[PDB]
Design a protein around this ligand. Structure first.
Ligand SMILES: CCCCC/C=C\C\C=C/C=C/C=C/C[C@@H](O)CCCC(=O)O
Ligand SMILES: N[C@@H](CCC(=O)N[C@@H](CS)C(=O)NCC(=O)O)C(=O)O
Length: 155
């Protein structure tokens, strides 16, 4: 039924890497090490991936389990249906902006989470918990005006 990302989310047309390879991105673990907007206290979320766009991460209050699917109307975007250990449920949308698969991935995430106003973010994932801001993203970050990503709770 849902064939495009929520109204107000940034489709980022023209700003996403060419040739995104889902096969190489949705494997292994991804640490969420930095983000444009951040909460307090900062934490270290490890995103564990599995086949068929499944993922697990250690969320704000308990493990979170998500099942993904492509969004037909928006190239590069995925919809995740997530459930939480406290019994909650939500939908979240994401696109991989840039990645080298082996080290870092810059993502865009957006959702309504029950509101009419979207909450979004730019997220930097690393394969190591000690990962920081890669030299290779320098110009791309400048272009997106992401000049000062907040470091989170991983080291
Ligand atoms: C391997 C990376 C996979 C990323 C998957 C993207 C989305 C589904 C997973 C988690 C979604 C979390 C939703 C939290 C919403 C809210 O707390 C976030 C505020 C803004 C933001 O950080 O996106
Ligand atoms: N604000 C709404 C929606 C909150 C919501 O859906 N939160 C989701 C996404 S922020 C969640 O439980 N996330 C858990 C996590 O990210 O660890 C409510 O309180 O009912």
């Amino acid at each position: 039924e849902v064939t495009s990302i929520p109204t107000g989310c940034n489709a980022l047309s023209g700003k996403i890497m060419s040739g995104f390879d889902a096969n190489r991105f949705f494997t292994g673990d991804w640490y969420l090490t930095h983000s444009r907007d951040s909460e307090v206290p900062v934490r270290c979320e490890k995103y564990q991936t599995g086949s068929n766009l499944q993922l697990n991460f250690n969320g704000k209050n308990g493990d979170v389990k998500c099942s993904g699917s492509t969004v037909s109307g928006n190239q590069g975007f995925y919809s995740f249906q997530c459930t939480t250990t406290s019994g909650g449920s939500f939908t979240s949308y994401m696109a991989v902006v840039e990645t080298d698969y082996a080290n870092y991935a810059l993502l865009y995430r957006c959702g309504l989470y029950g509101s009419t106003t979207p909450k979004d973010n730019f997220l930097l994932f690393n394969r190591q918990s000690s990962g920081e801001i890669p030299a290779g993203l320098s110009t791309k970050l400048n272009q997106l005006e992401l000049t000062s990503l907040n470091k989170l709770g991983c080291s």
